[PDB]
UniProtKB/Swiss-Prot annotation:
<dbReference type="InterPro" id="IPR000073">
    <property type="entry name" value="AB_hydrolase_1"/>
</dbReference>
<comment type="function">
    <text>Cleaves H-Pro-AMC as well as a wide spectrum of amino acid substrates and several peptide substrates without a proline at the N-terminus. Proteases F1, F2 and F3 degrade oligopeptides produced by Tricorn (themselves probably produced by the proteasome) yielding free amino acids.</text>
</comment>
<comment type="subunit">
    <text>Part of the tricorn proteolytic complex.</text>
</comment>
<feature type="active site" description="Proton donor">
    <location>
        <position position="268"/>
    </location>
</feature>
<comment type="similarity">
    <text>Belongs to the peptidase S33 family.</text>
</comment>
<dbReference type="GO" id="GO:0006508">
    <property type="term" value="P:proteolysis"/>
</dbReference>
<dbReference type="InterPro" id="IPR002410">
    <property type="entry name" value="Peptidase_S33"/>
</dbReference>
<dbReference type="InterPro" id="IPR050266">
    <property type="entry name" value="AB_hydrolase_sf"/>
</dbReference>
<dbReference type="InterPro" id="IPR005945">
    <property type="entry name" value="Pro_imino_pep"/>
</dbReference>
<dbReference type="InterPro" id="IPR029058">
    <property type="entry name" value="AB_hydrolase_fold"/>
</dbReference>
<feature type="active site" description="Nucleophile">
    <location>
        <position position="102"/>
    </location>
</feature>
<feature type="active site">
    <location>
        <position position="241"/>
    </location>
</feature>
<keyword id="KW-0378">Hydrolase</keyword>
<keyword id="KW-0031">Aminopeptidase</keyword>
<protein>
    <recommendedName>
        <fullName>Proline iminopeptidase</fullName>
        <ecNumber>3.4.11.5</ecNumber>
    </recommendedName>
</protein>
<keyword id="KW-0645">Protease</keyword>
<dbReference type="GO" id="GO:0016020">
    <property type="term" value="C:membrane"/>
</dbReference>
Amino acid sequence: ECIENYAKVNGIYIYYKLCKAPEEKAKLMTMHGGPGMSHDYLLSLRDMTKEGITVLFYDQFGCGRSEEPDQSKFTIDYGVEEAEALRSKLFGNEKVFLMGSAYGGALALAYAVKYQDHLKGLIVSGGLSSVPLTVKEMNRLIDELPAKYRDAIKKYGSSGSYENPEYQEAVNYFYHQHLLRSEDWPPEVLKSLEYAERRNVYRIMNGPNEFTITGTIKDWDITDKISAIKIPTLITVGEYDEVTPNVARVIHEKIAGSELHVFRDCSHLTMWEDREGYNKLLSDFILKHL
Ligand SMILES: CC(C)C[C@H](NC(=O)[C@@H](N)Cc1ccccc1)C(=O)O
Ligand SMILES: CC(C)C[C@H](NC(=O)[C@@H](N)Cc1ccccc1)C(=O)O
């Protein structure tokens, strides 16, 4: 059973779940996506504890069970400092591996750019170094959808009528094709989605949905900074990932020595679509860079 707590970090109370032992070989911090989701959908990574990998989960500022800070702090830079504060105020000076999913991936990239000296390795899953680029690729995905849904997206989407059933059915389709390719989504994934809708971070930083990123990060782009990352890096992406392998390729190019792995028959939530394979890949990576 993991150890759960609700302590104050860089000024605000953050919820975290530390799943450690047995025979710990390394520690791994995880950064969920959204922005504005919760750690819940990453729980499948908990399996790695059986491989000697302690896993740290936590809900970022304003996310899930964590308290929301002042609006002025709704930035990726703030998320990075929040993350370093948690690592230090939990593992002291220990070197740790960092894993980020989607937005969590971009956040993990920003973190590495500044604090890679506190890391043994970096893992980015369905991540991005440029929101604009990700939008470009997502737009292509929308057009590749059957006219039926594609039209509803451009129609109600351009009218801000996200409360329409046709538009809604179009979003559901896109999700079942590029977010999670499953007819029965796990409770953990559903909980994080619910959390995003309940809090404000998702609406303020991201936007109405996965492919309608009109939040405060819409222009965020640090592709020209990531080349400064020199630590072991593992980049993963799903074949049908809403954050396409083309976006992943851009990250891979800049980080020398990094690895790029495309999960066939998978989309964005690769940790659920191929749980055993996803965990094995990360476990082998971590264990080979102690
Ligand atoms: C639906 C939630 C749980 C999934 C999440 N998705 C994201 O992080 C998107 N915000 C990706 C994005 C695109 C462009 C610019 C910023 C972010 C996840 O899988 O973690
Ligand atoms: C899309 C419906 C079923 C809710 C839920 N989606 C979310 O919580 C957002 N991340 C995406 C969203 C899409 C459309 C309308 C509101 C939110 C889900 O997919 O389970």
